[PDB]
Write a protein that binds this ligand. Structure first.
Ligand SMILES: Cc1cc2nc3c(=O)[nH]c(=O)nc-3n(C[C@H](O)[C@H](O)[C@H](O)COP(=O)(O)OP(=O)(O)OC[C@H]3O[C@@H](n4cnc5c(N)ncnc54)[C@H](O)[C@@H]3O)c2cc1C
Ligand SMILES: Cc1cc2nc3c(=O)[nH]c(=O)nc-3n(C[C@H](O)[C@H](O)[C@H](O)COP(=O)(O)OP(=O)(O)OC[C@H]3O[C@@H](n4cnc5c(N)ncnc54)[C@H](O)[C@@H]3O)c2cc1C
Ligand SMILES: Cc1ncc(C[n+]2csc(CCOP(=O)(O)OP(=O)(O)O)c2C)c(N)n1
Ligand SMILES: Cc1ncc(C[n+]2csc(CCOP(=O)(O)OP(=O)(O)O)c2C)c(N)n1
Ligand SMILES: COC1=C(OC)C(=O)C(C)=CC1=O
Ligand SMILES: COC1=C(OC)C(=O)C(C)=CC1=O
Ligand SMILES: COC1=C(OC)C(=O)C(C)=CC1=O
Ligand SMILES: COC1=C(OC)C(=O)C(C)=CC1=O
Ligand SMILES: [Mg+2]
Ligand SMILES: [Mg+2]
Ligand SMILES: [Mg+2]
Lengths: 594, 594, 198
């Protein structure tokens, strides 16, 4: 029971009681007492990163992988905290938590200029739900207790706790047996709100549900699918909702937006007369101009956060609610409406949506040498099972991936959709694998993304964390080249050079096979489209044999323009479209997944 | 003359008029208009980085390399700005400027949740002299004009300018012929202040001058040496003042502090009866407890910043002045005192200091296999010329390097002494080489530092920026291991693993030769101490031949405890000391440098 | 039912549903649309103060008198908000709420040195649970809805809502019949805790 211990020792009991089992971090002098308490306690597995930014993105991937997870990132004073800001921003922007813990200079030296001491509280405030330098040892467990309530409550977001060295080592009295986590705050919709929502949905003749990341955040994916099935309403996931209904479900109508979207998704949204928004916001990359997105449509919006409602457009009905509480009531009310014979039949509208999904395609089956990227994603759909979990960040790699890959369970698309920091992919994928060693993790990067934090592959080697990394290499910042076409230029976006150690990369610059191997991983390079599939097979075998990351690098043609535009009705198709399965053979309409 | 142009076009004329010729950066959609204006203008050479943090530390190295330089770092919106915070902190903490320029979302979308848009103004405020989102196109040249005044004036520090996309492209009328830079503010000491300072110096019987980074910041190194020569007063540089008097000068008395210090420097400081501080602050790693540092000593402190004076101790005489203005007057007053026969002879005190410098040494000449790090620095002193310019960051690598390497001109020790962010070394060294292609740049890293931003070597390959990187590899976070001895542990600090592609690294984990070669550079690995010198010779040859970075990796013994302690009189010597030149042959007392 | 109205008309329905019946204030040009909506709605009794600091402490006394009360303090842009800071500090310091509402310059002119315009959001942040300039008219009811949650939940404290003139007068669709106050967050001790204390 009650006993004298260091404040960091009480902190270990608190993290244990809050369900922490894993941490990613980089030790330093100012945070050694915490590491000492973590060693003495046991039962937190620590993974040492090779950049503090790598530890922070591993924590993000750990959070995102499984509902209720909270990744922990640990660092010393000074530059470790400033290296965590990009991750605090990324987690804040997507409404997910990580817990960052930094060492700090002793309290009495906070406003002197002590070595490697910085005002991390002020720097991190704009990108956290709480950022606090703890000023008393007895407050260390209470701040952690309040941190966990905030990471779980309302709109979730990250917390940074900054620990002065003397606060860490100071003795306190603490009783772990008496510690209890705080209740989680989550507002719930009333029946009056939900019956009104179902009333408007029954009155719409061509409705769609837009299912956002809040559905997954609430762990409500099964309820979302059940509600759509009862009402026979087609479902359009946002990028952050992707996976909350399987891609081969008859009601899954594609994705909508300016970039990570399908031609059939956009066409179905513009044909609809109602958008039933659950756990989405209405992001600019999803809507385009809001006047066009809402034209002729009733808009319902359910969000856990009151000030998200009305932020970018005025809904016809806005409801403050956790997505699981709201969907429980929506299923119950729809079941009552079904018993009463009041749910309209929707066979015609559903058939129109399925006809769009069958015909408005983009070509993937290219035999070109050098390889066209869209062929890579077709081969990934064939090579990996329906249980595949993809990890990606940003670039033409990621946009075409979202256009062409398919996903079948929630939290099998792991993507930092609002902030998009380059370098996220490798550490996030390691964090997913740490959360779930049985997860079939496959990452997608372009060459530039892959280079930012390439050193994290050695983390996978040192700790034997296996996954497959697909690397699509155009020796370009490809997304920025394509955006520069409006300025009639191609400037500071090329990565090619004659590699003095590798004439076999043919002027593409970095030799990613050699780099990955020096970092202790396995790697295969592919020049021809017919060699992609066997390469994925060797990679699975190499992964089982050595239990390290395996990189499959595909050498792309230098220049491919991915489909995108400024409005839902203005997306330009640069590459070939398709209206037949032979050109686009991995659409779920044509292919049985696993 | 006067003409209509985009605000970014006016920004190019302003940067030109302010002497900018180089930028380091990573383009993105939100900052494309600036890149378009930079392409159209010509005459700024852009170096594309492979991490935004790499661009920001390149800018720091460019600033530090040459007086009056200001490195420029360019990035897009969102995570690019958050990736610059560590560099803004590093530059702020050492009182040096960089100019960071980020793209931003259009003004009318700043408080919506636009894609990759973040409140970088609020995040960067604690670590900049100015951080401003520019809200009008006509203000773009005025903000840059005020930025340059602030980067040069008072205590220097960095500025971040955040540019909304619509502000960048908006047309304005601007006349480059009428643009003029603002005057620089620098307070100057009065003759009354300086005559009082010289009076106290003449009254001291055993004075030392402590010459800080402010002397170099003011470009006053030649005046500092001249003043010390006229007064015959021994000079103790801080780590940030190192190089402002040559290490082989008869008055250079060593360095003082808890870590980057000499046994003879500390012994000379504790024997002195006055510290004449010029352009230093009195940093905790330099002083230890201030009660012991000041015991029995008069303290003079000259600083350009009023609130630096008295911050950590109360000087007997504090003077607000730029170091060059103050040293001009100090030379003039000392010349008057010399003509008047009023400067005391100091042969005895100088002889005592030189006797300490001759006898209180640390051994470097180790024949051990595996190699002892101190032998590496002895070989670096022999291999490179007196014009060598070292670049380093932090770790046992850097601390022993500062204890054992020697430097002979100001701005030939390039070191982020207050913030110490891992990964700084490679990009800072590239920035020094970009500032001065004739500089003989040699970097020193440990393996962990080297891994953080290892991908930046490919920048050196793509652009042919040659320098030598000395990599001392213990497969450890060595400084953190040594600090963990107080907690009787060795925990989360090892980087070793059996590399499945390289049994020749013998369980040291990452194969840095293979990684460096895949990045397009050259690399040599050394296992035996007698092979270090030939390796430095091949590296010079490989560098001349291929004009890329050349890495020389020395395989160290896993565990070496560097000398350090908690007070000037409490530094523990773990490894062998020396009192004879055979054990420490590269001290300047024994070796003629070049 | 749902109807077109100004954002400030919707704010009156929200204040009504949240139980406000009284306000203490000093009008000015930048907060006139709010006063117009209060007058049209009726049923908030306004008491005119003879110093903005006096309205702000009237609001404190109104809160403290009766459990569940929330005093409301109204003022115009500029110095009216800076005159409310001492009350926001005093309410925060004692863990009690007041709701301060200030007028503000229109959004397009927020960083333009417009007459009597100040960054009250930044000034009031240290002494409030929330201090916010509302940047969309449709957000006015939602900001007020979150404010009442914050003033009642956890450790109570005050909120300042800052309303740009153009946000006040813009039209929105709002249904007073569908508005519902948010649930109040109040942690409870477990029986294991209370038995240990006894
Ligand atoms: C290059 C690139 C291109 C992209 N292209 C597109 C595109 O074409 N189309 C597209 O849609 N996206 C696209 N995205 C992603 C886009 O930027 C957004 O991240 C995404 O649209 C937001 O999804 P969402 O609306 O579900 O919001 P989320 O960020 O997932 O959040 C939605 C809401 O969930 C709420 N919430 C949180 N927890 C709960 C809970 N328990 N219950 C209820 N609500 C809760 C939050 O308050 C928030 O308002 C792209 C991203 C990138 C990097
Ligand atoms: C691992 C490690 C170990 C270290 N060990 C030591 C050690 O043992 N000893 C040691 O001394 N350092 C050590 N350092 C470096 C130390 O942390 C400080 O960076 C350094 O001591 C500060 O030097 P300084 O006093 O010259 O200050 P600076 O940071 O260089 O600044 C001094 C002053 O210059 C002023 N100034 C700026 N411009 C001008 C101008 N134009 N004119 C006049 N004044 C101006 C500023 O206002 C400031 O107050 C170590 C660093 C690391 C990373
Ligand atoms: C830190 C950071 N800097 C800049 C950007 C802007 N950005 C988005 S995509 C991109 C290029 C990515 O190139 P690569 O990963 O090679 O992918 P490709 O588009 O070529 O497939 C850049 C620079 C960003 N997202 N993050
Ligand atoms: C971003 C960041 N995280 C952590 C630290 C703390 N730190 C200082 S030195 C060090 C280990 C450096 O090891 P290496 O570069 O291998 O050098 P060695 O001490 O082994 O010679 C660490 C983690 C830091 N300075 N910066
Ligand atoms: C993409 O790499 C770059 C070059 O190489 C072609 C250049 O010549 C110039 C001027 C800029 C650049 O970024
Ligand atoms: C019969 O199964 C199929 C569907 O569901 C009806 C579809 O919607 C589409 C587009 C293809 C298909 O095979
Ligand atoms: C330094 O690498 C590490 C290990 O490997 C020896 C471990 O076993 C554990 C438990 C932590 C660790 O960081
Ligand atoms: C004669 O040159 C020399 C000195 O200067 C007098 C010294 O101070 C020392 C320590 C060695 C030396 O050779
Ligand atoms: Mg890196
Ligand atoms: Mg690319
Ligand atoms: Mg090391």
């Amino acid at each position: 029971g009650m006993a004298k211990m260091r404040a960091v020792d009480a902190a270990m009991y608190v993290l244990e009681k809050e369900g922490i089992t894993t941490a990613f971090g980089v030790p330093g002098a100012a945070i050694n007492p915490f590491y000492s308490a973590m060693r003495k306690h046991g039962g937190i597995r620590h993974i040492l990163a090779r950049h503090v930014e790598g530890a922070s993105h591993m924590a993000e991937g750990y959070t995102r992988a499984t509902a209720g997870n909270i990744g922990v990132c640990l660092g010393t004073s000074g530059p470790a905290g400033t290296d965590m800001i990009t991750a605090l921003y990324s987690a804040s922007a997507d409404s997910i938590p990580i817990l960052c813990i930094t060492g700090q200079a002793p309290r009495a030296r906070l406003h002197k200029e002590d070595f490697q001491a910085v005002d991390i509280e002020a720097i991190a405030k704009p990108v956290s739900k709480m950022a606090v330098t703890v000023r008393e040892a007895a407050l260390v467990p209470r701040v952690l207790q309040q941190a966990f309530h905030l990471m779980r409550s309302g709109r979730p977001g990250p917390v940074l706790v900054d620990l002065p060295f003397d606060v860490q080592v100071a003795e306190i009295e603490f009783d772990p047996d008496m510690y209890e986590p705080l209740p989680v705050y989550k507002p719930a919709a009333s029946r009056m709100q939900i019956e009104k929502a179902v009333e408007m949905l029954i009155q719409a003749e061509r409705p769609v549900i837009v299912a956002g990341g809040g559905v997954i955040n609430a762990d409500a994916a099964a309820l979302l699918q059940q509600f759509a099935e009862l009402t026979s309403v087609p479902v359009i996931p946002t990028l952050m909702g992707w996976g909350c209904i399987p891609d081969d479900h008859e009601l899954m109508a594609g994705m909508v937006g300016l970039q990570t979207a399908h031609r059939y998704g956009n066409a179905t949204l513009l044909a609809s007369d109602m958008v039933f928004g659950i756990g989405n916001r209405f992001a600019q990359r999803h809507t385009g101009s809001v006047e066009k997105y809402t034209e002729g449509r009733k808009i319902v919006h359910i969000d856990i956060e009151p000030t998200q409602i009305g932020r970018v457009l005025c809904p016809d009905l806005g409801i403050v609610s956790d997505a699981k509480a709201a969907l429980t009531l929506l299923v119950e009310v729809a079941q009552e409406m079904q018993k009463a014979g009041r749910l309209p039949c929707r066979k015609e509208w559903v058939a129109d949506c399925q006809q769009r999904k069958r015909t408005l395609l983009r070509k993937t089956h290219f035999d070109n040498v050098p390889v066209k990227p869209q062929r890579v994603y077709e081969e990934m759909n064939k090579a990996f099972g329906r249980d595949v979990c993809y990890v990606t960040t940003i670039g033409l790699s990621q946009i075409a991936a979202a256009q062409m890959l398919h996903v079948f369970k929630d939290r099998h698309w792991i993507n930092c959709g609002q902030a998009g920091p380059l370098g996220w992919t490798i550490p996030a994928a390691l964090g997913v694998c740490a959360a779930d060693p049985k997860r079939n993790v496959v990452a997608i990067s372009g060459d530039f993304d892959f280079q930012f934090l390439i050193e994290e592959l050695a983390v996978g080697a040192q700790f034997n964390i296996p996954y497959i990394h697909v690397l699509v290499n155009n020796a370009y910042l490809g997304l920025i080249r394509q955006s520069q076409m409006a300025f009639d230029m191609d400037y500071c976006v090329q990565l090619a050079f004659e590699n003095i150690n590798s004439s076999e990369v043919n002027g593409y610059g970095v030799d990613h096979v050699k780099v990955a191997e020096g970092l202790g991983c396995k790697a295969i390079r592919v020049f021809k489209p017919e060699d992609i599939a066997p390469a994925f097979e060797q990679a699975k075998a190499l992964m089982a044999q050595y239990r390290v990351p395996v990189v499959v690098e595909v050498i792309l043609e230098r220049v491919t323009n991915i489909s995108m535009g400024s409005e839902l009705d203005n997306v330009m198709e640069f590459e070939d479209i398709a209206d037949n399965a032979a050109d686009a053979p991995t659409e779920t309409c044509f292919m049985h997944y696993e």
